[PDB]
Write a protein that binds this DNA or RNA. Structure first.
Lengths: 200, 81, 108, 94, 96, 200, 94, 102, 81, 96, 200, 200
DNA sequence: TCACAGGATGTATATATCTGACACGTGCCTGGAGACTAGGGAGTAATCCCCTTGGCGGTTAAAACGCGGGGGACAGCGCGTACGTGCGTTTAAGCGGTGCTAGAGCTGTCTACGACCAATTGAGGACATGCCCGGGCATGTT
DNA sequence: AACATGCCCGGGCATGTCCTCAATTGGTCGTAGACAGCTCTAGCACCGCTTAAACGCACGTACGCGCTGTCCCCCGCGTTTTAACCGCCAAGGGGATTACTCCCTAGTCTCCAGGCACGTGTCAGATATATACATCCTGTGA
């Protein structure tokens, strides 16, 4: 169905200097997740681990939370709600925390919460923020994307943006970033193809 | 009318050939000459009569003969034209 | 009113310019005919006419006659190499022919 | 009477201006008439075709001037051209 | 007695008939030949003496001209006599 | 049927500096939508997305609305109401928001309204105006045109002008612009043809 | 640019009537255009003189018919005349 | 129109040509009709003979050579065109008997 | 330029004579042929040029040649006209 | 070895060249000959290739036609070989 | 809509030797109706006179009738009812005898009847049979076809067969024939094209 | 789900000499439907017309019916019910006659019936049998296949056999035939590929 | 066997007799120049595109050059038939009227068609506008 | 990495409409043709007389046709050299096309003299007859 509104996608580093980072994975065939700085785009396999780093210039208050949401990149599709396709919605792959229809999951975190927004009808996944561990300048969240971008009756090949928001206890906005996502069978091949088209 | 082609006498054929510088003759010439003359004369007549019929006359005039001749590359002076 | 002077008189020609302009400008030859054209042609005809008559008159005196006859015109035309092209195929009444006898026919 | 223009007048006048003490027999005169008409038809015919070929409306001294060269041998052509030039030159000048 | 050698008269006749201007075919014969030919195309056709003379003079001219060319062909074959072949050759050369 | 009046097509930027803009699409034979600045003309496929940008020198009040209406360009036909043809008027292709017979639709927007004017008999589609996102410079509306210009019994090959009006909450005229529209199966081929004929 | 007159269309159509399966080279088509224009000029030129001599005011089927008989050999003339006669006859009835 | 006379050749063209070329002041409308029929008839005679000539050489197409042969193989046309030259016509394969070996 | 009459070469003269069915060609023919061909060319060109000059062109076209040929009693097809 | 006793080739050439349509003269030299003559009447004349083609076909046609008649004259003299005087005769008969 | 059945299209000359014939029309521009024996196909313009001849070896009884019906030629479309397109169905071109929606009409005959068959939903037009006029071997009926084959929402570029049935006063079959029909702007152009393709 | 049984696939011409036939369509890349005699296999696009001919040596009684059913060709999967995938099951493409979940439909025929077998859980589509006209040798039924073989959650790339059975008005078995079916985007490409593998 | 002188025949020049050429005068009939106005042709200037003219390199055929033998051609000789020439006789042509009818030639009057001009509708080719399948890319399994 | 398999834009083809030129239809006015009538000339037909030409028969030489021998032109084949032919590129001039302006021509009007046609008279040419010059035939010379 259609939403009454479109989430803002503008980058906003805020008081804490918020930003996103990603692992230096290669473009090999067998790669499960890889990121392109040139495209600001993540390429990943369905249900595989997708590390996203959170970077800040100063530590946010306790009770700060991190939310991930998907929207279609093309402006005419922006009001449609991104969701899993009917096949993957019916199949028995829920982890006991995520609703069957949600596209984005967070793995390894018991404090995760999944929202189907009563006003906008948007799906999103939220976790608490935690400051970086010893020997890292950043905090890493492991996402899983539960449909390929190509799934018919789902995203149906339309590109999506993952929007990441840093938020306070009430859900007010502390910072925002976004990156394009492709969920596909061969991330290394597809990343190289799109980076090559950048010269064409 | 018939046989007036014989009217073209053998000496007359001599005289014509004499004017053309001809000195000595084979009798075959007489019959061949009459053939050639007939063809030439017949073609001229046929044209002249055709003009006459076009004008819807009964009588051929010199002008019809002049035109009949002329077109075959035979401009004739002295009869009009 | 200015008293009439004929175009033949203006051009200094004997042949009648007005007639010629009529023979050009009507009787299916042309769309338009300019005034100099008849004059030019009349002179040409006059010149050629004179050439034939001049040659023929000599032939007439070579035959001690004061009156030109068809024979003389024939002789003139065939003795002049250029006329013999211009009128090459013409036939002339009572013209006769030139006294041409081939050398191989002569007695010896 | 029914009318037929002939050149006999002018033909004899030209003779008188060449061999004053001579005359023309009626048959020689008939010939000169056909001669004039023949040369007249040719030049008029050729001048007509020149204008046609060049897709243009007026017969002028030039078309005749050209026709004369095509019809006449060179020697006659040049004399004739000279005369035709003078007659027109004088006529326009007078 | 006298008696010309076979084939001398010609040179007189040649000059006489080259020199003179009268017609060489007789009037009545030629006239009837014209009518005899013309009737085949149209009966009751009628004539002008000027027209008949005009035909005659063209025919004599045609034959005389033909004979001269015929004569040259015979000379070219180095013969004294003209033959039908000489006529045919000359005509064929003129595309007749 | 015939209208009692002709809508004014005169450009009027008004107090807010209202102007239109369009995307830099190529001239590919069967491109979905493409615009010609040289002709001030849009070339688009039937029912496909037609992005129109709204540009302003200052932001209009809240409650402002944007209306689109079609008129025939040729003066003789200006009094006729531009509508869909009998075939596309009967076809079952309504989206649950637009009336069957309206030529112009807006996609994506749940707050759209469709007017059949009781006085002029004209058809028009309206949405609330929205300002650009912070860091953007214009607002994009996505129109769909629901008949080819060639439809017999409808536009019947007659060119149309889309008139865009900026309006207050009551329909009062705040600003006006217009562009010529061709709805056709092969927009890029047709666009190139018209731009070449501009040199002839 | 400029545009041209020729008979190539009609020549092509006639060829189909005599030989439906046979094509024609552009060069042969060139010949045929000269042939048509030549025969046209002869007939028109002759018919012109027939009218001139008889001092008549016009070219009619008659002058053409006569001219055809003067230009063509007899056999071709017969057939040509028959066709011309039918054409004028039919055209008059049509 | 041509469909009136049943002709393929265009009468009105012929009519305009007859009005020009300085042939005459005036025309009787049967004239171009009659002339068109004649030109068409002669055209057919040549093309028909030419197609046969093309078939003898086993070609589906007429070339100037075939017109040349076809014309000369009908002495009526040979006479009518007895002064014409045909571009790339070639000539007839006539050898005089006196030249052959014996 | 010059000496292009020598450009009408001997075997080319022979080939023409082969079209004429000629079986044997004497040594003197080639000169005589060249002379004849020159006269024919001179007459045709002179007339063609005259047509071109009359039109005040510098360029001789096929039509100029076709006309120059026509009036010499010879019509050419296949070059226009 | 083998070599022809003469003339069978000549008959073959007659066959071939009578069969074939193309130019038998050289393609370029004739064009220069046209310039060389034309300049005598006027300098700086310019030549359409089509015009020069027309001249070629006319000249070949003229010479071929002349050779036909030349051949007949030679046959009439019952000679195997053609001679200048054969050409001269055929021309003079044709009124050149 | 669809039909419960397909009319038989088989050629059946019956007791009377029934056959069809057509005029020897050319292939020129503006030709109203032209028939191809090679294709067994009639090419005609919208609303123009289409003469169809009826041939018989012996005369049927008085009260015999002649019926024309259109079916789609392609076997998967045979069950759809052939009818006019929505535009031509609405336009004011009824002659006072034909219903607005019927594809085939008969002109010049006051005894024409139009049937919308209650059981099969098929349209057809019927007239009395008449024997040939004195000196004629056949009887001519003038049909009109009231939509182009290309009309969208109508025949929509699908070929149709016209079926002609000779039948008694109760509608029982006496004889049957059929021919393909194309209704188009240029029957001569199209007929030549389809006949030329027969050699390719 | 899994069926309690596997339908018999054995060919049985029966009392009426029943056989199947197929059109001589080529292998143009995107040909809508094409058949391989070498593989006894049909290659066709989703929802497109699949003409199957019915051949008989004598006409079956009135009230005879023709039924089509699908089974998986691999013995490991023969007990699974061939059905549409969850996406195509939910989408709004029912023609007003077929249930949403059925793989096989018959187009054009108003007298079609769809059975979901209470005992075997097998889907099938049925129509009345119709004889050909006396000089035509076979009757053509036009099937549609409503999922690609590759549909995930449905056929999931597993090959299927279509089983065709002739029945009386009570459903007793009068004859049976079968053929393999691949439902795919490029039937001509795929047919050539599998026939080339027959030489490998 | 080949060419010139005297006589005869053909062509040119003079005298006698008769006809035609040529010269001079009067009345009739346009034909011709002088004159004026307006659509048009022709002329002059400007601009753009294609062809002609000019240049260079490589490869093949044409042509040029040389020798030998066959046939053609030329020269000379012999025999028979046909043509040419002379004389005499008969018929036709030419010449010179005599008579009659049709056609040609010319004039007048009336009708139809042609020519010329405008408007309306069709012929022909080019363009205006949409759907399929193919090509190729997009995206997944082994 | 290669093969498995779905989806969108492009080339082409499918199919409806426009613009430019030709044909058709109608009207108006003038000229030519068509049709009829009348007059005179020429043609056609017929008869008589005289001379030349043609026809027929007889007689002789040259020309034509046929045959043989001798010498040089030509053809045929091989080898070597030069330009033709072919392929590709560049610049300038000419020809073609379009617009604008003036003067030749055409068309229509008026008036006077010359030419044309017919009539009248004398001188020199034309023809016929007779004499001299040029060419041919017969006889004579080399």
């Amino acid at each position: 169905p259609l939403s009454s509104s479109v989430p803002s996608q503008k980058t906003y580093q805020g008081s804490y200097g918020f930003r996103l980072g990603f692992l230096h994975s290669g473009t090999a065939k067998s790669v499960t997740c890889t990121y392109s700085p040139a495209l600001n785009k993540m390429f990943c396999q369905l249900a595989k681990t997708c590390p996203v780093q959170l970077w800040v210039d100063s530590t946010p208050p306790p009770g700060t939370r991190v939310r991930a949401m998907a929207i279609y990149k093309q402006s005419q599709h922006m009001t449609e709600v991104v969701r899993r396709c009917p096949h993957h919605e019916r199949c028995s792959d829920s982890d006991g925390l995520a609703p069957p229809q949600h596209l984005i999951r967070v793995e390894g975190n018991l404090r995760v919460e999944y929202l189907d927004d009563r006003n906008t009808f948007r799906h999103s996944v939220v976790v608490p923020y935690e400051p970086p561990e010893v020997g890292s300048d950043c905090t890493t969240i492991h996402y899983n994307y539960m449909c390929n971008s190509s799934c018919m009756g789902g995203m149906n090949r339309r590109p999506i943006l993952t929007i990441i928001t840093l938020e306070d206890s009430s859900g007010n906005l502390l910072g925002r970033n976004s990156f394009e996502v492709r969920v596909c069978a061969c991330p290394g091949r597809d990343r190289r193809t799109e980076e090559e088209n950048l010269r064409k | 009318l018939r046989d007036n082609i014989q009217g073209i006498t053998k000496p007359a054929i001599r005289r014509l050939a004499r004017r053309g510088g001809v000195k000595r003759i084979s009798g075959l010439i007489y019959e061949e000459t009459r053939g050639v003359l007939k063809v030439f004369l017949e073609n001229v007549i046929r044209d002249a009569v055709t003009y006459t019929e076009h004008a819807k006359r009964k009588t051929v005039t010199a002008m019809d003969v002049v035109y009949a001749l002329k077109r075959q590359g035979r401009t004739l002076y002295g009869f009009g034209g | 009113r200015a008293k009439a002077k004929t175009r033949s008189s203006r051009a200094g020609l004997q042949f009648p310019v007005g007639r010629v302009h009529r023979l050009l400008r009507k009787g299916n030859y042309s769309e338009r005919v300019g005034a100099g054209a008849p004059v030019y042609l009349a002179a040409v005809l006059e010149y050629l006419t004179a050439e034939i008559l001049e040659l023929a008159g000599n032939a007439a005196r070579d035959n001690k006659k004061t009156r030109i006859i068809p024979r003389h015109l024939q002789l003139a035309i065939r003795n002049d190499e250029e006329l013999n092209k211009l009128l090459g195929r013409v036939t002339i009444a009572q013209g006769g022919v030139l006294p041409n006898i081939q050398a191989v026919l002569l007695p010896k | 009477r029914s009318r037929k223009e002939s050149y006999s007048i002018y033909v004899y006048k030209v003779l008188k201006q060449v061999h004053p003490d001579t005359g023309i027999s009626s048959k020689a005169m008939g010939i000169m008439n056909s001669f004039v008409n023949d040369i007249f038809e040719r030049i008029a015919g050729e001048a007509s075709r020149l204008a046609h070929y060049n897709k243009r409306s007026t017969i002028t001294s030039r078309e005749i001037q050209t026709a004369v060269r095509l019809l006449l041998p060179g020697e006659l052509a040049k004399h004739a051209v000279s005369e035709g030039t003078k007659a027109v030159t004088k006529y326009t000048s007078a | 007695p006298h008696r010309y050698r076979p084939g001398t008269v010609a040179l007189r006749e040649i000059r006489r008939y080259q020199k003179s201007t009268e017609l060489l075919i007789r009037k009545l014969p030629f006239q009837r030949l014209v009518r005899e030919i013309a009737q085949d195309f149209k009966t009751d056709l009628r004539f002008q003496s000027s027209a008949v003379m005009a035909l005659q003079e063209a025919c004599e001219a045609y034959l005389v001209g033909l004979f001269e060319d015929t004569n040259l062909c015979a000379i070219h074959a180095k013969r004294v006599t003209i033959m039908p072949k000489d006529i045919q050759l000359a005509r064929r050369i003129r595309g007749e």
